[PDB]
């Protein structure tokens, strides 16, 4: 009974489109990073960003390429098969529309909500029941334009929401390591 955990933050490089929270993975990774203070880097046979983290009585490998999306799917593909890690150890973070623009969505099997990247990860990783941590950024009002509405740019609204949820999820995470998620979920996953 012993095994580390791997984390992968899927977001959007550069910017422009990243403003649409298309950089949740990197936004959350950076946040949790700026908090942890860990000194990440960029390399690996793949050539992406990553950093090790010790806590929760276990190590944590947080990685994240550039393009992320497809870059991640593939990046992990080999990187995943390279490290030979388990699916219950790998956790891919992303953004998704669930309710309002300031919620999170952490699950295991549940994932892949239409995306070349995500699909590239499944095909790259071949699917092993890996874990995923999607964020709840607004919800689909209809069929008018969900993706369009998901790729808005609440830079501001999101700016406050980014730290709002991140803060909430950050607490849930910390508490999770403190004891369990039960409280974090009832505390954080309660709002």
From Swiss-Prot:
Highest taxon above the source species: Bacteria
InterPro entries: Pept_tRNA_hydro, Pept_tRNA_hydro_CS, Pept_tRNA_hydro_sf
EC number, as in UniProt: 3.1.1.29
An annotated GO cellular component: cytoplasm
Cellular localisation: Cytoplasm
Any one GO molecular function term: tRNA binding
GO biological process: protein quality control for misfolded or incompletely synthesized proteins; rescue of stalled ribosome
Keyword set, alphabetical order: Cytoplasm, Hydrolase, RNA-binding, tRNA-binding
Sequence positions that bind tRNA: 17, 68, 70, 116
PROSITE patterns per UniProt: PEPT_TRNA_HYDROL_1, PEPT_TRNA_HYDROL_2
Catalytic activity: an N-acyl-L-alpha-aminoacyl-tRNA + H2O = an N-acyl-L-amino acid + a tRNA + H(+)
Site (Stabilizes the basic form of H active site to accept a proton): 95
HAMAP family membership: Pept_tRNA_hydro_bact
Protein name: Peptidyl-tRNA hydrolase
Gene this protein is translated from: pth
């Amino acid at each position: 009974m012993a095994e580390p955990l791997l984390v992968v933050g899927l977001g959007n490089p550069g910017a422009n489109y990243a403003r649409t929270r298309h950089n949740l993975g990197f936004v959350v990774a950076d946040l949790l990073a700026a908090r942890l203070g860990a000194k990440f880097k960029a390399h690996k046979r793949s050539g992406a960003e990553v950093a090790t983290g010790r806590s929760a009585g276990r190590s944590l490998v947080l990685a994240k390429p550039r393009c992320y999306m497809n870059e991640s799917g593939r990046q992990i593909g080999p990187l995943a098969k390279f490290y030979s890690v388990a699916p219950a150890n790998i956790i891919v973070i992303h953004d998704d529309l669930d309710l309002e623009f300031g919620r999170i969505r952490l699950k295991i099997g549940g994932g892949e909500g239409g995306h070349n990247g995500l699909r590239s990860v499944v095909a790259a990783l071949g699917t092993k029941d890996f874990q995923r941590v999607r964020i709840g950024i607004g919800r689909p009002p209809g069929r008018k334009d969900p993706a369009a509405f998901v790729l808005e740019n609440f830079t501001p609204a999101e700016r406050a929401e980014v730290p709002t949820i991140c803060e909430q999820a950050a607490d849930a995470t910390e508490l999770l390591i403190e004891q369990g998620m039960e409280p974090a979920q009832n505390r954080v996953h309660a709002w």
